[PDB]
């Protein structure tokens, strides 16, 4: 409950052309644990301990596809673990590939 | 009489075989483990050692269920995440994918050897 919901960002954006790259940007407040990146479904998943503390409020975790083909379209969304509790998930993204 | 012996206990260990194969089959919706057949996978270890199994499955869920990999051709493999209550849900504790998987080969294996 006290815990603020995550965002997700890709960079350079949603649309990337075929076999170009994509980063999913999941931010959390300070001290999240773990950032899981979550599909269309919540059993199709990537989870990452490696967060990095930007700011003394905002930290964040990143997900990076090198190549993406059309398999890799579709929805993404971000989810944190701090204090013993999952956050409320983030906003679905939409990954358009060309 | 020595050869019937010899496929007497040679039934015995494809019928174990077989009944711990067709448990994880039935449960991960799985035909393969680590790289090889099921059948392959258990000319090399125990038919009822669950902690190489569980880890085998944890090893294989990870790497076939993920964000990066694009298309899953097995969603029924994944799914056994929300049988497990491996999913996130919010306001919960963390629930860790190997132990939960541990839990699960543990009753499939006492669930085999059950039938023998
Ligand atoms: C799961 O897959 C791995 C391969 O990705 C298999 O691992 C390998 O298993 C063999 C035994 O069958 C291990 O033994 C031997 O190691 C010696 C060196 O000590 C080497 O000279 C042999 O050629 C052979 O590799 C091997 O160390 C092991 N390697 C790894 C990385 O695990 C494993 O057997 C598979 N499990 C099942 C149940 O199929």
């Given at each position: 409950?006290?815990?603020?919901?995550?965002?997700?960002?890709?960079?350079?954006?949603?649309?990337?052309?075929?076999?170009?790259?994509?980063?999913?940007?999941?931010?959390?407040?300070?001290?999240?644990?773990?950032?899981?990146?979550?599909?269309?479904?919540?059993?199709?998943?990537?989870?990452?301990?490696?967060?990095?503390?930007?700011?003394?409020?905002?930290?964040?975790?990143?997900?990076?596809?090198?190549?993406?083909?059309?398999?890799?379209?579709?929805?993404?969304?971000?989810?944190?673990?701090?204090?013993?509790?999952?956050?409320?998930?983030?906003?679905?993204?939409?990954?358009?590939?060309? | 009489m020595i050869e019937g012996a010899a496929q007497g206990a040679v039934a015995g260990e494809a019928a174990?075989?077989?009944?711990?194969?067709?448990?994880?089959?039935?449960?991960?919706?799985?035909?393969?483990?680590?790289?090889?057949?099921?059948?392959?996978?258990?000319?090399?270890?125990?038919?009822?050692?669950?902690?190489?199994?569980?880890?085998?499955?944890?090893?294989?869920?990870?790497?076939?269920?993920?964000?990066?990999?694009?298309?899953?051709?097995?969603?029924?493999?994944?799914?056994?995440?929300?049988?497990?209550?491996?999913?996130?849900?919010?306001?919960?504790?963390?629930?860790?994918?190997?132990?939960?998987?541990?839990?699960?080969?543990?009753?499939?294996?006492?669930?085999?050897?059950?039938?023998?």
């Amino acid at each position: 409950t006290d815990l603020p919901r995550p965002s997700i960002s890709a960079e350079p954006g949603t649309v990337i052309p075929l076999g170009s790259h994509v980063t999913f940007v999941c931010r959390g407040p300070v001290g999240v644990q773990t950032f899981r990146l979550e599909r269309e479904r919540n059993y199709l998943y990537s989870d990452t301990e490696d967060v990095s503390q930007t700011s003394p409020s905002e930290s964040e975790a990143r997900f990076r596809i090198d190549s993406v083909n059309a398999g890799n379209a579709g929805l993404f969304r971000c989810i944190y673990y701090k204090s013993r509790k999952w956050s409320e998930q983030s906003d679905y993204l939409e990954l358009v590939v060309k | 009489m020595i050869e019937g012996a010899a496929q007497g206990a040679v039934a015995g260990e494809a019928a174990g075989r077989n009944a711990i194969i067709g448990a994880l089959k039935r449960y991960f919706h799985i035909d393969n483990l680590n790289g090889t057949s099921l059948k392959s996978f258990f000319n090399s270890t125990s038919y009822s050692d669950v902690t190489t199994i569980a880890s085998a499955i944890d090893t294989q869920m990870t790497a076939s269920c993920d964000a990066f990999s694009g298309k899953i051709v097995n969603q029924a493999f994944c799914d056994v995440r929300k049988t497990l209550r491996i999913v996130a849900d919010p306001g919960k504790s963390f629930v860790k994918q190997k132990d939960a998987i541990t839990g699960a080969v543990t009753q499939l294996v006492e669930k085999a050897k059950d039938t023998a």
